[PDB]
Amino acid sequence: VSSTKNGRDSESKRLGAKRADGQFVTGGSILYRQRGTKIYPGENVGRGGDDTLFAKIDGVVKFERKGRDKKQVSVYAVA
Amino acid sequence: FEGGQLPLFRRLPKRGFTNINRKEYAIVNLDQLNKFEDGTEVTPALLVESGVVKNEKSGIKILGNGSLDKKLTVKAHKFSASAAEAIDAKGGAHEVI
Amino acid sequence: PKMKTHRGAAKRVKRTASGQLKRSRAFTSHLFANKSTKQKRQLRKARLVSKSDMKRVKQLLAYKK
RNA sequence: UAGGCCCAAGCGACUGUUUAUCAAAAACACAGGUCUCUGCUAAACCGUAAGGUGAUGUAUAGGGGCUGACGCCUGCCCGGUGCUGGAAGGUUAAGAGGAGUGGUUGAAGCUACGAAUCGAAGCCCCAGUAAACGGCGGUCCUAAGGUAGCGAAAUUCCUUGUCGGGUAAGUUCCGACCCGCACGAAAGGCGUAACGAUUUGGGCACUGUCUCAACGAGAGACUCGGUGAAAUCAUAGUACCUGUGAAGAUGCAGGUUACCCGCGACAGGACGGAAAGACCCCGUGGAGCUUUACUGUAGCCUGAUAUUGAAAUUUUCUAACCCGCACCACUUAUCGUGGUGGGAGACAGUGUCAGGCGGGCAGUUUGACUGGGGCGGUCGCCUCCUAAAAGGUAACGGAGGCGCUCAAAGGUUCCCUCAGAAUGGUUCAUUCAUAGAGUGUAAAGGCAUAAGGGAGCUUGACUGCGAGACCUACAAGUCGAGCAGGGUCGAAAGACGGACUUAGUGAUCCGGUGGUUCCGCAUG
RNA sequence: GACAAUGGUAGGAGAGCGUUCUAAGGGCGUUGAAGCAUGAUCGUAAGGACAUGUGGAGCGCUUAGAAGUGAGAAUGCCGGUGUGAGUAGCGAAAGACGGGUGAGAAUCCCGUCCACCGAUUGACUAAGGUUUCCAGAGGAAGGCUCGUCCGCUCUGGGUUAGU
RNA sequence: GAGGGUAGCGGAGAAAUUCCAAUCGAACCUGGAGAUAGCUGGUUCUCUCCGAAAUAGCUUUAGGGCUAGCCUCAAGUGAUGAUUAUUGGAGGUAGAGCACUGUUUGGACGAUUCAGACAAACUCCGAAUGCCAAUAAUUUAACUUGGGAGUCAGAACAUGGGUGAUAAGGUCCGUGUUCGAAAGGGAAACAGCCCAGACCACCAGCUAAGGUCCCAAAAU
RNA sequence: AUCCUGAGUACGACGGAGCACGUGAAAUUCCGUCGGAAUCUGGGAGGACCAUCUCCUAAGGCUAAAUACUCUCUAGUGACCGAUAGUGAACAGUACCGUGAGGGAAAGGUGAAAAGCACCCCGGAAGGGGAGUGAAAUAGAACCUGAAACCGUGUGCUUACAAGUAGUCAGAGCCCGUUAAUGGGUGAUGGCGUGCCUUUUGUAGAAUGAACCGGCGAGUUACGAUUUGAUGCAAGGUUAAGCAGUAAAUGUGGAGCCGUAGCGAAAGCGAGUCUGAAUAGGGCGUUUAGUAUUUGGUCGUAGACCCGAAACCAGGUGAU
RNA sequence: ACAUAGCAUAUCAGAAGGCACACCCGGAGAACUGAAACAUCUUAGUACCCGGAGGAAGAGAAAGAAAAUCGAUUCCCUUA
RNA sequence: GCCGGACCGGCACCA
Numbered sequence A: 001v002s003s004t005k006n007g008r009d010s011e012s013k014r015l016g017a018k019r020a021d022g023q024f025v026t027g028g029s030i031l032y033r034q035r036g037t038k039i040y041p042g043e044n045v046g047r048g049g050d051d052t053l054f055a056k057i058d059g060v061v062k063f064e065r066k067g068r069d070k071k072q073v074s075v076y077a078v079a
Numbered sequence B: 001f002e003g004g005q006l007p008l009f010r011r012l013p014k015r016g017f018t019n020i021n022r023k024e025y026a027i028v029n030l031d032q033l034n035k036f037e038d039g040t041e042v043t044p045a046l047l048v049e050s051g052v053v054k055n056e057k058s059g060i061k062i063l064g065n066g067s068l069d070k071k072l073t074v075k076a077h078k079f080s081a082s083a084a085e086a087i088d089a090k091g092g093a094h095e096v097i
Numbered sequence C: 001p002k003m004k005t006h007r008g009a010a011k012r013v014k015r016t017a018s019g020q021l022k023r024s025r026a027f028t029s030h031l032f033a034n035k036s037t038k039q040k041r042q043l044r045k046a047r048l049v050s051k052s053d054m055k056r057v058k059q060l061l062a063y064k065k
Numbered sequence D: 001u002a003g004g005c006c007c008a009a010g011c012g013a014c015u016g017u018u019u020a021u022c023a024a025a026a027a028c029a030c031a032g033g034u035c036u037c038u039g040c041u042a043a044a045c046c047g048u049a050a051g052g053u054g055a056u057g058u059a060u061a062g063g064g065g066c067u068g069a070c071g072c073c074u075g076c077c078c079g080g081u082g083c084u085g086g087a088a089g090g091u092u093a094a095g096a097g098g099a100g101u102g103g104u105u106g107a108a109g110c111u112a113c114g115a116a117u118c119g120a121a122g123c124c125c126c127a128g129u130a131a132a133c134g135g136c137g138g139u140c141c142u143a144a145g146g147u148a149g150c151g152a153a154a155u156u157c158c159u160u161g162u163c164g165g166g167u168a169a170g171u172u173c174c175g176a177c178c179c180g181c182a183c184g185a186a187a188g189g190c191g192u193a194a195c196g197a198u199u200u201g202g203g204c205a206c207u208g209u210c211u212c213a214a215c216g217a218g219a220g221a222c223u224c225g226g227u228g229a230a231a232u233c234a235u236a237g238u239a240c241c242u243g244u245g246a247a248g249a250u251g252c253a254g255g256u257u258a259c260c261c262g263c264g265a266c267a268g269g270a271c272g273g274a275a276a277g278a279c280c281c282c283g284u285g286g287a288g289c290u291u292u293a294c295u296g297u298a299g300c301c302u303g304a305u306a307u308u309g310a311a312a313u314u315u316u317c318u319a320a321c322c323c324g325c326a327c328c329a330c331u332u333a334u335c336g337u338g339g340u341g342g343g344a345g346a347c348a349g350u351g352u353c354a355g356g357c358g359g360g361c362a363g364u365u366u367g368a369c370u371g372g373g374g375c376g377g378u379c380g381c382c383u384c385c386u387a388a389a390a391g392g393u394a395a396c397g398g399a400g401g402c403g404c405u406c407a408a409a410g411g412u413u414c415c416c417u418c419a420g421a422a423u424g425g426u427u428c429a430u431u432c433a434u435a436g437a438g439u440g441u442a443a444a445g446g447c448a449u450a451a452g453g454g455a456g457c458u459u460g461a462c463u464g465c466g467a468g469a470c471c472u473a474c475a476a477g478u479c480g481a482g483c484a485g486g487g488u489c490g491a492a493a494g495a496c497g498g499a500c501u502u503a504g505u506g507a508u509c510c511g512g513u514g515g516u517u518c519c520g521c522a523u524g
Numbered sequence E: 001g002a003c004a005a006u007g008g009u010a011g012g013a014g015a016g017c018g019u020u021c022u023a024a025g026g027g028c029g030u031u032g033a034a035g036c037a038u039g040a041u042c043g044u045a046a047g048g049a050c051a052u053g054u055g056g057a058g059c060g061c062u063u064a065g066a067a068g069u070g071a072g073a074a075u076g077c078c079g080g081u082g083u084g085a086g087u088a089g090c091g092a093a094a095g096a097c098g099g100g101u102g103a104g105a106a107u108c109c110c111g112u113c114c115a116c117c118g119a120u121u122g123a124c125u126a127a128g129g130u131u132u133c134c135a136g137a138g139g140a141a142g143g144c145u146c147g148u149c150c151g152c153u154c155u156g157g158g159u160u161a162g163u
Numbered sequence F: 001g002a003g004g005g006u007a008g009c010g011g012a013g014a015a016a017u018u019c020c021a022a023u024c025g026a027a028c029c030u031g032g033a034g035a036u037a038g039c040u041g042g043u044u045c046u047c048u049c050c051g052a053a054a055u056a057g058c059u060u061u062a063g064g065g066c067u068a069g070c071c072u073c074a075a076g077u078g079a080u081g082a083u084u085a086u087u088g089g090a091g092g093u094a095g096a097g098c099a100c101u102g103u104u105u106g107g108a109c110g111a112u113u114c115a116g117a118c119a120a121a122c123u124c125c126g127a128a129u130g131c132c133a134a135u136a137a138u139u140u141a142a143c144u145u146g147g148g149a150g151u152c153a154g155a156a157c158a159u160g161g162g163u164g165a166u167a168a169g170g171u172c173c174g175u176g177u178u179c180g181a182a183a184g185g186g187a188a189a190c191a192g193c194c195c196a197g198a199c200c201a202c203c204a205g206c207u208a209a210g211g212u213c214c215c216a217a218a219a220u
Numbered sequence G: 001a002u003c004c005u006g007a008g009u010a011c012g013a014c015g016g017a018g019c020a021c022g023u024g025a026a027a028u029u030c031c032g033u034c035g036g037a038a039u040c041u042g043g044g045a046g047g048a049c050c051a052u053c054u055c056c057u058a059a060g061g062c063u064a065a066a067u068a069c070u071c072u073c074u075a076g077u078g079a080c081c082g083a084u085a086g087u088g089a090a091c092a093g094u095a096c097c098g099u100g101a102g103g104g105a106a107a108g109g110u111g112a113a114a115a116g117c118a119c120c121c122c123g124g125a126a127g128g129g130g131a132g133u134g135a136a137a138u139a140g141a142a143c144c145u146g147a148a149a150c151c152g153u154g155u156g157c158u159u160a161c162a163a164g165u166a167g168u169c170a171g172a173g174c175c176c177g178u179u180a181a182u183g184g185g186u187g188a189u190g191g192c193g194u195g196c197c198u199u200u201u202g203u204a205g206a207a208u209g210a211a212c213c214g215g216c217g218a219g220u221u222a223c224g225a226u227u228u229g230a231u232g233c234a235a236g237g238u239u240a241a242g243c244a245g246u247a248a249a250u251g252u253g254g255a256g257c258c259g260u261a262g263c264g265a266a267a268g269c270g271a272g273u274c275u276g277a278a279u280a281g282g283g284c285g286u287u288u289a290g291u292a293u294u295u296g297g298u299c300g301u302a303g304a305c306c307c308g309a310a311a312c313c314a315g316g317u318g319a320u
Numbered sequence H: 001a002c003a004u005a006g007c008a009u010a011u012c013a014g015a016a017g018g019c020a021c022a023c024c025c026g027g028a029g030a031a032c033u034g035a036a037a038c039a040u041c042u043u044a045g046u047a048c049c050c051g052g053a054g055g056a057a058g059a060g061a062a063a064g065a066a067a068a069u070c071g072a073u074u075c076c077c078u079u080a
Numbered sequence I: 001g002c003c004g005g006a007c008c009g010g011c012a013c014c015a
């Protein structure tokens, strides 16, 4: 007969990218959900208390290289 | 009924109370006061007679929406500040009765 | 006979000008040490009955205007 | 027409009784035994009561429990439960009692509460009680660890135990052994003559039970005259084989076979007829039953108070109340009602209120998931893999963690850089060392901008918010720039609305506490 | 006129057919209404006509209104009639022949012989039934066949108490 | 034998759940009463247009229900929908590799080095795809608000995986198709495979899958 | 106001009950038990309670009308039934069933008029064939009409080598001749072809249901809600009960209801308001359309689409 | 003891029982059911049973409603 | 939680 000691999992947190490179976003739009800095805050982008990356102004999202092994996301005004 | 899930009106809290002595007034605006000619004395009886006010409630309150454009002596139970100012500034007068 | 109002619901909602129902918020009775300051501050603010819930419960408050 | 008999074993002593209609028995009863209650208006029982049964009886009697003639006997345990008896030490209700507090009008008054203290039974405690409920293990422990007798048994799982007898051959039987899975002394132990439509083994007699069937008689069947139903039934001109198919085909495919219609026969199929499967599961279905399930309740016990009085200090008295107590009358009357004596007596009974006991009786509850159900496991939250390089994604798939902690382990400014190894020294020093350390805690993602280490100051682990987003059926959950009010650190730019991030939680209703430019039922 | 669309369960939407009743209008009918029956008729469907026969007194059409408004299934309810089928059965047993009656006789009556019960298949009380008792007449149905017979049908009768 | 008595929350019981008027774990009759039935069965004329679902979440919930998803009807809005091309991006699978963690086989040297292998929870690396967006070609939706639903048993096949045994016409998820709700041709017959979507009529024609000796159309 | 004006009363405590109101801050009314006032300078009520004010005057009784019902009677009515309907009952609480309480049917129609068939014939009769009556007797009493299942008689085509959901498409032969239509009946022979309903992932299914035929047999109505269509009026819209009228339309009736203003728990303020210290920000609002009646759809309360439990309770009937 | 109870007589005829007992007043009073279980609650003071009457019954002449005042009871509309 | 002894013992307990 027997039984299993497993069978547990937490709810999935729906992390990852929320806006695309080259997309226009209003200020405050969440750009990236993550644990830790998998992607860094770049220009006009903030990092929240739970590592969320969000736009500080309205503009266009740009995911870019940051050094050799890191990356960042910025937001540039359309003008 | 939600099939045994706690219903919305049980999961939300009750709020507030009903005032037993609550007063509600029949409201007349200045654009409604336009109907009468200049120099007329407006009373609650006159308002009910001409049909502007259907039910008197706890009294008659004059409110400041719209434009008056007439000179009147308005006798009512309550006036808003803007309604009183507009009545007085159009050449007329108001009195709380 | 006349339809009966749902008395608990009538004690919990109010009717807005456009026909919406203003409601209070759950999680506002106790255990406030287990909730953040922002959580309680924003739970202080009222919301509306959602559209799906309204589809379910409209007839319970038909007389409540 | 009229007993078959014998040997041996289990059970029950015996005659009797029982499931009308599948059980007649080893079950019930029984005479006998024992325990217990009961002093008579007995106890017990029926009834709301009156009235009754018990009994026109009176402890050699009546009710209840268990055992079950008779013979020999019936061992240990009173820790637990029940029962019996103590004690008034603690705990508790009505009721008594009023310290005191508030509301209102400087009071009183009215009003809402209200604390010492008193206040029974029960329970907690002690003792006894086992033919009371029960228990009679695994140096250790217990209340105590099975006496006599019996034992592979109506009890023995292994098991057809082993040995002997009976047979040519015996899983049954009889006799022994004891290793009693899991006998055992009145839910009685071991025996027992007689008895049994009882169960079991053996033998004689006897036979169509059988080897192995044959013949004969009669009633049906069968033919004719008369009379004439029924269950069933989608329509039917209703073949077989191999296959196909909801996985077992008269009816589909491909073959094979078969001229049309009766009658007597047989039962392989028509998953044949019959009864909306009794098994099994499911329904927030029902019913009967149980109890240390929940909530009640008939009834019983106990206290206060009313009926309910009079004197001493529990005792006394008589006059209310009571007598299924005697005599007398109504009255040819074991009812009743009055009268007189006697008994008892402010008790009892009864009413109201209170506390306790109360499967005697009642209403109900007693989850779901599940490779059927039960049993086991699981049930919310966090992290990883499965998960197919966005997100999401299941199984009783594979691994772990959480229901906190920290007054700094928070904020800010400044400074600093680790593990390991080798080499020398009775932790100290040098060089390699991108982290191979540390990060409160599980994992993953991050971090030497350090998010890791230390130091000074400090309390932003603020108040009112909040454009805009993420997540999402809802209720919830998450991030958030900026704005204002006041601060902390820093020279300053600036940072700070707890913690490297992600678990550490629980709705509503109701109640408690603090505040309150709110309401407050004619007015205050 | 030239292009497109039109499989469909649960289900949504639309347009219609037919039934009964009502209002108003307009009609049919003993020179034959409704209903029923038959036909080789018409419309995209539900359905609508016509002709003939039967029937014997009511009934269409138009517009609108209102509904007990449409059945093939509920082991549906009621009624009728099949199938099984000339099949099972005809309910413990001894009858035979002669004579009679009669439309008709195994079955009724008479006779002879035979057979069965006889601690009873005999005889008498009670309960229960309630006219079944008797006579004459009858034979549709009842009688498990038949029936001239009967506990059946018709008519008329019958029960007498001081013990 | 006769005459009587005990009655259903009850009687009676030498005790069997036994009997109380042919079925007693609580008789029968009438009434409350059309109890309740998240269950089974049934639900009656026609044609036309559209046309699902068998999923998620929560549920004393699991063959029930609610909200969402998918259908329909009507109003609105108006490029916001679909596909492809180009361009930009997020991410760690296939494969590969051993730089970390772990596993492992031979050498050599005084643990290091050399060579060679293994991994869902290893990664110095890393596709094809798929996804998110931006402005050209093609295309026809898309969204909002209201009225009305049904669905919450799914099945096979192919493929990426778990589980089982690289068993099952097994089971649980991802992806696509078909059945469901789809007739027609093929696969002998054969829901789920292959071809292909039936408005009606024709004794016209061309093809698909599959076929062309006879059954049986077309090549001995 | 000298005297009187309802005493075991009012009231209170405890336990209950009735009040829309479940003991609640519970006023007001009643019952049981126990206690227990005052006396116009009094007493009660105004939702705990106190004070003030206001209203009233318990513990005695009587009292028509507007209201409720229908086994009845009289006079009438119906977009109610028309013999399986409508009462169970058009001819019955009968027949029949049960010990009993109790359950409980079936069954209407000749014809205008009985003129209900004199008489003859077969037959014991029954029943027939004539003859008569009648407009009609296949209107002859088992009587209007006379469907279907089912049972028979006659025969135009066809059938005894054939394997079948019985048809359909093709098709000779034979027989007929119409609502006259590129007709009717039958059918050698060839192709194709496993009923219907329900329930299902999937049913020829060997899963369910139906012997056949006929009749009967299931989303209705009332009152509310919401939405859509229609119509009237429009910053307005509309009456309810009642009264009048013919059981009508309608007239009258403006009480009331929905709109014209929202926001707030509330006091309140008001085109704003709430939050807030804020002249900030944010929520809900303003920046015209409603209302009455009604067709359709859907929901709620009612049994609510129909049939079906095992059971529960109450009052009776049974020991033949 | 007196009386009373009791026992006879004489006169009267008051009660009894029935119903459409439908409606009404009073006593007493369920359960299935709903709450998606169930006990408070609901079904419901309903069904049933019992008593008493009338053409009606019940209520009725303020120790009332109220907050500007009204003026017995009952019933209809509305409040809702 | 209320109280008596040294936690024990009774009582109380309707989000």
Ligand SMILES: [K+]
Pocket: none
């Ligand atoms: K005794």
Ligand SMILES: [K+]
Pocket: D078
């Ligand atoms: K003891």
Ligand SMILES: [K+]
Pocket: D371
């Ligand atoms: K499973």
Ligand SMILES: [K+]
Pocket: D387
């Ligand atoms: K994943």
Ligand SMILES: [K+]
Pocket: none
């Ligand atoms: K007799």
Ligand SMILES: [K+]
Pocket: none
């Ligand atoms: K839905």
Ligand SMILES: [K+]
Pocket: F098
């Ligand atoms: K490696």
Ligand SMILES: [K+]
Pocket: none
């Ligand atoms: K009280």
Ligand SMILES: [K+]
Pocket: H025
């Ligand atoms: K009454």
Ligand SMILES: [K+]
Pocket: H036
């Ligand atoms: K329920």
Ligand SMILES: [Mg+2]
Pocket: A049
């Ligand atoms: Mg932080």
Ligand SMILES: [Mg+2]
Pocket: A049
């Ligand atoms: Mg944080």
Ligand SMILES: [Mg+2]
Pocket: D012
């Ligand atoms: Mg015996």
Ligand SMILES: [Mg+2]
Pocket: none
């Ligand atoms: Mg015997």
Ligand SMILES: [Mg+2]
Pocket: D019
């Ligand atoms: Mg038996």
Ligand SMILES: [Mg+2]
Pocket: none
């Ligand atoms: Mg027997």
